[PDB]
């Protein structure tokens, strides 16, 4: 097993507690080997002539002392080891979340949400189990069994030990074999149950069509057939799942019978004693567990190896797609100029942007138009440092963005995406997201600026309601707009944020925002060309290039490009 090799850092950080756990485990094992021998000695003293009240009292007292010592030391070594397990789990959760927070859209393009959730909910469990439970099974399968075997060999006898320990290895091997073939059948049965669940989901979601063709009878026939198949798979599992108790019972009772009969024969030959026979029986009883522990260790350590490999691959080797470099000395962006920038998404070969160049003065207002898929939002995505910078130069006041720190850049940009992104927090929290709780009065002023306060009033004032579990596309868009506004950004980007509200509402909002943000840059992306009529700069994006460049008047003068011919369709 290389898991303990891949987790050297954890044990190095926590070595005192694991050292205490291991030492206390060895001590507990040693002082737990005593009580059976004391029982045998008591039996021998009973049979032998000399046995006075002093012996009885001493045996009772020593048994109580050993019981208390084993109890305390067991509590504390389990505390150390399983606390290490919990600490490893918590550390892995923290590390995984901290790594995710610093990742970029490309990483999630490569890595699906389902896989990432699985790693953070199962692989952590497996690794933590390895750190705590793997170590317990390693000590009990390697130290406890060897200690109990050596004690039986020396204190009791060697012939009796070897004879009585023949079936336990067979029991362990058979247990592992059953584990493998029950795991296989269990996977089969779980797949069958998944098929059942999928069919039930189909039959329940599409209940209208099923009912509309009086097919609710054929549906039940198929469901019953699939339940019958599930029953067959479960019975196949139970076939090998019912071989465990018979096997352990047989190969432990055989071990007890060998011990008892052979010990009786040795007693006949004076090579043993009744007390030692009873001690041998107790030692076998306490030795049956190390057999299971071997297989449990192998299983847990292999699973932990796989889980830790996956976690490390999706936690460390992944390199952040965007990073700061040589921080500049720019406080407020003067102008934003694109100079023949070309950028292609990491997951595609088409350029999607061909030598785009333009300027945006401080306070300049830019509108973007174009058909769906015509690189409309890519122009601002390239400005959010979400993807590799490609080729060209995007210089804020004359210096490329790479020099600007990511923190400062993200501070300048107030970004409203076309997609609705809200969290399971009250609207107050969704709007406050921008300013991270610097003030509360500004909420009223910001919501008035977005002109959304009226739709805030008719919703119940239950801490501005709840979002993320329920309500309206327009209301979500206005909440996002207020969130981006309240931050007081020096470059405010809106991406189709007004495609859901009416023409009058969007017109009023754009008028108000243009009036309020006089010395600040604003980017507007919207298919409604009537919503950027007042923008001092407007451009239309087709493919990777710009079809034309000029003010609204220039576009009006040029050929009819989806200006008003589509009003009222």
């Amino acid at each position: 097993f290389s898991v303990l090799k891949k987790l050297g850092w954890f044990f190095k950080a926590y070595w005192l507690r694991y050292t205490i756990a291991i030492v206390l485990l060895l001590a507990v094992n040693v002082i737990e080997m005593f009580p059976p021998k004391l029982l045998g000695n008591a039996i021998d003293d009973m049979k032998a002539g000399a046995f006075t009240a002093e012996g009885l009292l001493f045996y009772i007292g020593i048994f109580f002392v050993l019981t208390a010592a084993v109890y305390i030391m067991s509590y504390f070594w389990m505390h150390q080891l399983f606390g290490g397990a919990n600490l490893m789990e918590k550390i892995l959760r923290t590390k995984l979340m901290g790594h995710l927070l610093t990742m970029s859209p490309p990483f999630y393009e490569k890595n699906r949400t389902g896989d990432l959730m699985a790693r953070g909910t199962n692989d952590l469990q497996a690794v933590s189990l390895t750190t705590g439970f793997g170590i317990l099974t390693l000590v009990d399968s390697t130290m406890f069994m060897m200690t109990i075997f050596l004690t039986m060999g020396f204190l009791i006898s060697w012939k009796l030990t070897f004879a009585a320990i023949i079936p336990l290895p067979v029991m362990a091997i058979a247990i592992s074999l059953y584990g493998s073939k029950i795991h296989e059948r269990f996977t089969e049965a779980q797949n069958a149950f998944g098929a059942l669940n999928d069919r039930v989901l189909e039959s329940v979601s599409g209940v209208r069509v099923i009912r509309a063709y009086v097919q609710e009878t054929n549906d039940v026939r198929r469901f019953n057939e699939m339940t019958a198949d599930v029953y067959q798979k479960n019975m196949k599992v139970a076939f090998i799942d019912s071989l465990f108790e018979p096997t352990v019972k047989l190969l432990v009772g055989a071990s007890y019978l060998i011990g008892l009969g052979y010990g009786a024969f040795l007693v006949f030959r004076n090579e043993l004693t009744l007390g030692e026979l009873v001690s041998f029986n107790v030692y076998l009883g306490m030795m049956i567990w190390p057999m299971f522990a071997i297989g449990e260790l192998i299983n847990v350590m292999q699973r932990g190896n796989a889980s830790l490999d996956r976690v490390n691959e999706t936690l460390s080797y992944e390199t952040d797609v965007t990073d700061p470099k040589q921080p500049a000395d720019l406080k407020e962006p003067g102008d934003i100029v694109f100079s023949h920038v070309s950028f292609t998404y990491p997951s595609s070969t088409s350029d999607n942007l061909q030598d785009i160049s333009f300027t945006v003065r401080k306070g300049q207002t830019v509108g973007i138009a174009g058909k769906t898929g015509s690189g409309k939002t890519t122009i601002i995505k390239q400005l959010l440092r979400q993807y590799p910078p490609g080729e060209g130069s995007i210089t804020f006041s004359g210096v490329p963005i790479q020099q600007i720190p990511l923190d400062r850049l993200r501070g300048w940009i107030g970004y409203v995406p076309q997609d609705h992104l809200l969290f399971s927090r009250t609207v107050k929290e969704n709007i406050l997201y921008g300013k991270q709780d610097a003030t509360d009065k500004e909420v009223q002023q910001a919501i008035a600026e977005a002109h959304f306060e009226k739709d805030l009033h008719m919703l119940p004032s239950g801490l501005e309601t709840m979002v993320g579990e329920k309500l309206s596309g327009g209301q979500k868009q206005r909440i996002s707009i207020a969130r981006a506004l309240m931050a007081n950004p020096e470059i405010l980007i809106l991406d189709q944020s007004l495609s859901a509200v009416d023409a009058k509402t969007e017109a009023a909002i754009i008028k108000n925002i243009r009036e309020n943000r006089k010395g600040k840059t604003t980017f507007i992306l919207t298919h409604r060309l009537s919503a950027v009529e007042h923008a001092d700069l407007i451009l239309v994006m087709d493919g990777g290039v710009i079809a034309e460049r000029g003010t609204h008047q220039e576009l009006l003068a040029n050929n009819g490009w989806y200006r008003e011919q589509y009003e009222r369709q």
Partner: protein
């Protein structure tokens, strides 16, 4: 509704398997538990038999052992050819055995100094001449018992294999009973789901209903496996153990019986603490997973707004609470569970030592080490299932609540009783007499809706959202009762025929054409199997390009395993149309509402509607107000009311709502 009553009711079915499993378990337990009794007879009658009196007898006698030149035979094998003639003993001092060739009355502390065994017993008794038995002579006192030893060893193994076979049988039969009970429960649950009204499905996410039908049934299966394989099995195992304990020695049997209260109190306390800790841990872990999900989704705004620090702080707060409660659970498991099992085991050892030491001190010859060995083995068997029992008892609650949910579903009363397919064609005439439909109560979604659709097809129900267009579809199929007025098909009230009879007359096409997983032919036929390879109805729908791409949709192509995602948006509608045409319904209802019509494909849909609308009575809820320019009877729904009962041309002449919704498109 009582969960226990319903579970017992479902278990009473298949009682043959349960009874057989119980009997097989009883026999296996009897064999296994009589094993240690065989061991205690072995130790006492045979190894310790030497401690019994010996009487001289002739060498002719069987089971006679020569000591020096004189043959003795034990009190158990003794017969009455000679009354006593002798009284010899084989006493034990230290690790040596001493032959006493004299009658001894008392017994006690034995001492040998100069070949004069003396038993004190607080009386000094007498000094008896004693001779060390060496090892060969001593073994010659055990050869008579070697054969009984071998015989008892053999009996042990036979009963062991017997118990093995019966253990396998009982475990398998318990598993079979659990699985079959759960299969019957699932059958009942789905059959009931087929009878629940559409209100139930509408007012409850599909995933929740599916989980109730499937997941909760698995929870009940786990509950059955727990009750049988843990509580019944352990109950019988411990009843047999206590029977054996009482048969061995009653005095210690009562003491051992005095641990059942120890199990009950332990179970109650551990349940109390572990249920709380598990509830908190599960809730916090659900919160952690939800946070991770809502952070991975929507991470763009988290990063763009520099919220990484705050989200990390919230996640760490949840993580610290989770760590706290996991450590508390570990603390409880350390103070209880295996540690307490070992403590009780050592207490049992001490109790045995105390009892047998008190017995031996009185020197009444009642040490009975065989009873001690059997008690050790039995008590050791009795402490195995304690941890499993307490864990399962704590865990019962989740399966109990799952069973409550499943039986709440089953015990639903408002269910539809139907199942009569129609025996005659509809003739295509559907009429409404001032129907007034209210979903919840009081609030009306349709007010005195009244219209008649002759055999001529293409009746259009078009209006602005919230006008109750799809409610008519619900009324037609009797998904929801009208609550007023009436609906007639061919003059027959829709509320005077079985829902199955009514829905046989009509076919449905919806906005999201359902594409059941399977073959295209089975999806078009709804795996009915009651129709032949007539899926050339699909071709009649003008699907001439899709079915030649690969294999054949007529039960030969299986691309629908992807929920229709890969197939074009228009092609799914073109499969649903084929399904509607295959069943040949008299009345076709077509609920179409798609702003993103996906042009360059919707054309075929129109073509499809020309092939299916003919020779029926078709209701078209389509939007866009352009596919219904040939509707025989247009209808405009406003505020749940037919405000303009007109035609494509008549409505245009009269202007109004339809004119506005046509000019603005």
């Amino acid at each position: 509704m009582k969960i226990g009553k319903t579970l017992w009711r479902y278990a009473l079915l298949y009682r043959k398997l349960l009874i057989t499993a119980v009997l097989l378990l009883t026999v296996a337990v009897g064999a296994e538990l009589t094993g240690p009794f065989i061991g205690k007879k072995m130790i006492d009658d045979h190894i310790l038999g030497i401690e019994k009196t010996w009487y001289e007898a002739a060498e002719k006698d069987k089971n006679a052992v020569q000591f020096h030149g004189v043959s003795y035979v034990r009190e158990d094998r003794l017969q009455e050819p000679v009354s006593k003639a002798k009284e010899a003993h084989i006493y034990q001092v230290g690790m040596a055995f001493y032959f006493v060739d004299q009658a001894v009355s008392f017994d006690g502390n034995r001492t040998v100094s100069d070949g004069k065994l003396t038993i004190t017993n607080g009386d000094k008794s007498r000094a008896y001449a004693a001779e060390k038995l060496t090892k060969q002579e001593l073994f010659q006192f055990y050869q008579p018992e070697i054969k009984g030893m071998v015989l008892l060893i053999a009996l042990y193994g036979g009963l062991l294999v017997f118990s093995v076979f019966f253990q396998y049988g009982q475990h398998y039969l318990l598993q079979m009973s659990a699985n079959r009970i759960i299969q019957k429960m699932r059958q009942d649950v789905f059959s009931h789901i087929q009878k629940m009204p559409i209100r139930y499905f509408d007012n409850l996410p599909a995933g929740k209903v599916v989980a109730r039908i499937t997941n909760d049934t698995e929870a009940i299966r786990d509950l059955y496996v727990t009750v049988l394989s843990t509580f019944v099995t352990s109950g019988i195992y411990m009843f047999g153990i206590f029977t054996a304990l009482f048969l061995l020695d009653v005095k210690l049997a009562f003491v051992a019986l005095a641990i059942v209260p120890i199990i009950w109190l332990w179970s109650v306390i551990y349940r109390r603490y572990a249920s709380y800790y598990n509830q908190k841990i599960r809730s916090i872990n659900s919160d952690i997973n939800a946070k991770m999900n809502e952070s991975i989704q929507g991470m763009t705004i988290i990063q763009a707004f520099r919220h990484q620090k705050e989200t990390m702080r919230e996640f760490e707060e949840l993580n610290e609470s989770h760590f706290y409660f996991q450590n508390r659970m570990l603390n409880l498991n350390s103070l209880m569970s295996h540690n307490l099992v070992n403590v009780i085991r050592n207490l049992a050892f001490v109790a045995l030592i105390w009892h047998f030491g008190g017995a031996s001190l009185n020197a009444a010859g009642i040490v009975s080490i065989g009873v001690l060995y059997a008690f050790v083995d039995y008590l050791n068997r009795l402490f195995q299932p304690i941890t499993g029992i307490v864990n399962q008892f704590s865990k019962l609650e989740l399966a109990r609540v799952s069973a409550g949910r499943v039986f709440e579903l089953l015990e639903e009363k408002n269910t539809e009783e139907a199942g009569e397919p129609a025996k005659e064609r509809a003739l295509g005439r559907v009429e409404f007499r001032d129907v007034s439909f209210a979903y919840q109560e009081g609030e009306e979604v349709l007010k005195h809706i009244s219209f008649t659709a002759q055999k001529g097809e293409t009746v259009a129900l078009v209006g602005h959202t919230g006008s109750g267009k799809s409610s008519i579809l619900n009324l037609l199929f009797r998904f929801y009762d009208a609550q007023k007025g009436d609906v007639l098909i061919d003059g027959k009230s829709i509320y005077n025929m079985s829902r199955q009879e009514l829905r046989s007359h009509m076919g449905i096409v919806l906005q999201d054409p359902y594409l059941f997983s399977g073959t295209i032919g089975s999806n078009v036929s709804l795996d009915d199997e009651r129709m032949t390879e007539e899926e050339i109805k699909n071709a009649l729908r003008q699907v001439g390009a899709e079915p030649l791409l690969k294999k054949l949709p007529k039960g030969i192509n299986e691309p629908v395993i992807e929920k229709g995602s890969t197939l074009s948006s228009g092609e799914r509608q073109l499969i649903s149309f084929a399904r509607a045409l295959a069943f040949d319904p008299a009345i076709l209802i077509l609920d179409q509402a798609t702003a993103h019509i996906d042009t360059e494909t919707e054309a075929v849909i129109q073509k499809a509607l020309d092939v299916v609308k003919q020779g029926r009575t078709t209701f078209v809820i389509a939007h866009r107000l352009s596919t219904i320019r040939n509707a025989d009877q247009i209808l405009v729904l406003d505020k749940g009311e037919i405000v303009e009962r007109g035609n494509h041309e008549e409505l245009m002449a009269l202007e109004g709502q339809y004119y506005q919704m046509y000019e603005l498109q």
